Design a protein around this ligand. Structure first.
Ligand code: FAD
Ligand code: NAP
Length: 531
């Protein structure tokens, strides 16, 4: 049961909300959180599909705000499984008694600024009404599942699942004819797991995404002990990087090197595994010819992975630059296609027409299935905010202001909507980074800002409209220096039909972006109106 007035409300109980709750307490503030879900964890609470695993390594993908948590906690594998990560979150939440500051089972529905009192009044599906000086939107980047644009979906007789709203109690596909739609990270992760239990597996792929080997391994518990001795320092280094990790920044250009050098250099990445390949060369995301050279190498690796060249060629990604859809880490995925019971249905030759109660109809045949798994992604970046009637000055709706794409200052706030902050979302580095580094800066930067308003006894913080536009024009200016906006991905909005095709994410580098937020805060929050 939620308090009637509060200094700051936080929506979302994943990494972001939890940390905001922790830190606002530290700074002597009344703070409370509302979360749709039954318990903490966010993505790692929702995404229980089998195979679910982080793609940034354990030693990197973690909170660094607590010397205690760094020293105590023991990660076991190169990449944490979803259960491992959920325990981690449960551990941190227990350590600081965080639930006491959280309402669960509660979806927020509407929020509305009030010029009279400079406060947000905020409503829920339980009928709660809450009044606050600030509202922190920590409701995520990949949180509202999206479903494919297909008729007959409610007719399917068998069992229907989305990977981001997966059952809490494990599913049995034993001896079933199972189908998966979507071959993004989710579809690539969950598929080899089902391949192992199902009688026959049908993988319905549209556009092939580029995937490289994870090469998971046990963590050497002595390497973890040396590291722990300099943990704070290790992390501080990851903060001083474009991507938030120790990924080496290749100084050279993909074009300047010989064919022989390109192969040997990319081969040492392919053997090691992980996503560091993205930065093998300075200009992979800057030059069509550079990219193409890297893209081809990866393409051949794929062809050598599958025995049936016909089926191999169907997996090769075509028509978009390498890296401009999110890069996926695979484990035994392409190898899966060698098994008698695994079938790759290519929806580009043969588009899906409809879901029948027996299964899936493409243009060429019909497929019969006991279960259909939807690994079709999310209403990315804007989706969770959009489900919420957010109204600010002049009764202006958030949804409409942003219909031509997100409009923000530093991604952190928007003109016409004072006292409102978005954690790790459009206009900022957000997902183009180890999201934990993205999430800490933002929680800190916002929370420092709230602390600053109270000490100086102010009550109203708004983005100057000119700066907001200056910023937005800046984000698209740099986006267009790269290869990013030239491909239909969730970054653009291209998976939600009708959504405006614009690249939603800052591309300058976490490092660069964070020194801008620092100068800003340093000059007393330049580009804001404070009263
Ligand atoms: C399957 C998956 C795996 C991931 N893998 C990686 C990875 O490899 N590396 C990486 O850096 N990042 C990864 N990400 C990105 C991920 O978003 C971040 O890593 C991070 O977990 C985000 O945490 P968060 O607190 O910002 O939001 P989330 O974890 O997304 O939490 C948002 C919460 O807000 C709640 N919520 C939303 N709207 C409302 C509202 N109306 N009312 C009440 N509650 C609401 C949701 O239920 C959810 O619990 C992954 C994402 C997914 C989907
Ligand atoms: N290992 C990890 O670290 C991990 C795991 C899961 C998620 N994530 C994060 O969250 C993002 C989501 O990954 P995701 O796989 O869940 O979602 P996604 O990347 O958006 O994948 C969408 C997939 O579903 C397909 N699809 C969507 N609509 C379709 C339709 N109407 N008909 C047929 N196919 C359709 C897409 O094909 P098209 O390409 O042709 O659109 C693609 O194959 C990831 O990129 C990453 O940022 C990370």
């Amino acid at each position: 049961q939620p308090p009637e007035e509060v200094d700051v409300l936080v929506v979302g109980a994943g990494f972001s909300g939890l940390y905001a709750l922790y830190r606002l307490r530290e700074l002597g503030r009344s703070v409370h959180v509302i979360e749709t879900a039954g318990d903490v964890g966010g993505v790692w609470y929702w995404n229980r599909y089998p195979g679910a695993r982080c793609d940034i390594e354990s030693i990197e993908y973690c909170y660094s705000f607590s010397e205690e948590v760094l020293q105590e906690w023991n990660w076991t594998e190169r990449y944490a499984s979803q259960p491992e990560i959920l325990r981690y979150i449960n551990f941190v939440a227990d350590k600081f008694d965080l639930r006491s500051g959280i309402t669960f089972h509660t979806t927020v529905t509407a929020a509305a600024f009030d010029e009279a009192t400079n406060t947000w009044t905020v409503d829920t599906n339980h009928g709660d009404r809450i009044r606050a000086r600030y509202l922190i939107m920590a409701s995520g980047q990949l949180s509202v599942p999206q479903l494919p644009n297909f008729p007959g979906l409610k007719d399917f007789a068998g069992n229907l699942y989305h990977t981001g709203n997966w059952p809490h109690e494990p599913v049995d596909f034993s001896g079933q004819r199972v189908g998966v739609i979507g071959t993004g990270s989710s579809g690539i992760q969950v598929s080899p797991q089902i391949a192992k239990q199902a009688a026959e597996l049908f993988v319905f792929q549209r556009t092939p995404h580029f995937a490289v080997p994870a090469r998971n391994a046990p963590l050497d518990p002595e390497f973890l002990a040396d590291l722990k001795k300099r943990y704070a320092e290790f992390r501080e280094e990851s903060r001083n990087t474009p991507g938030g990790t120790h990924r080496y920044q290749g100084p050279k250009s993909a074009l300047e090197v010989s064919d022989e050098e390109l192969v040997e250099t990319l081969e040492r990445y392919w053997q090691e595994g992980g996503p560091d390949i993205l930065a093998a060369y300075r200009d992979i995301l800057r030059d069509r010819d550079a990219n193409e050279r890297v893209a081809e190498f990866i393409r051949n690796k794929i062809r050598n992975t599958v025995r049936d060249p016909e089926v191999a060629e169907r997996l090769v990604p075509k028509g978009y630059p390498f890296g401009t859809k999110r890069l996926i880490l695979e484990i035994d995925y392409y190898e899966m296609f060698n098994r008698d019971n695994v079938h790759l249905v290519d929806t580009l030759s043969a588009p899906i027409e409809t879901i029948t109660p027996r299964g899936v109809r493409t243009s060429e045949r019909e497929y019969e299935l006991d279960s259909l798994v939807l690994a079709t992604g999310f209403d990315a970046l804007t989706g969770a905010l959009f489900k919420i009637d957010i109204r600010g000055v002049g009764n202006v709706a958030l949804k409409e202001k942003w219909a031509a794409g997100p409009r923000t200052y530093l991604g952190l706030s928007t003109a016409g909507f004072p006292n409102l902050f978005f954690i790790a979302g459009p206009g900022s580095p957000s997902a183009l980074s180890n999201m934990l580094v993205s999430i800490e800066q933002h929680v800190e930067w916002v929370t420092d800002h709230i602390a600053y308003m109270f000490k100086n006894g102010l009550t109203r913080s708004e983005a100057v409209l000119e700066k907001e536009d200056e910023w937005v024009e800046h984000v698209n200016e740099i986006a267009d220096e790269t290869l990013y906006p030239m491909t239909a991905s969730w970054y653009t909005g291209a998976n939600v039909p009708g959504k405006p095709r614009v690249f939603m994410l800052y591309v300058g580098g976490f490092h660069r972006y964070r020194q801008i937020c620092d100068e800003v805060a340093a000059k007393g929050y330049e580009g804001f109106v404070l009263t």
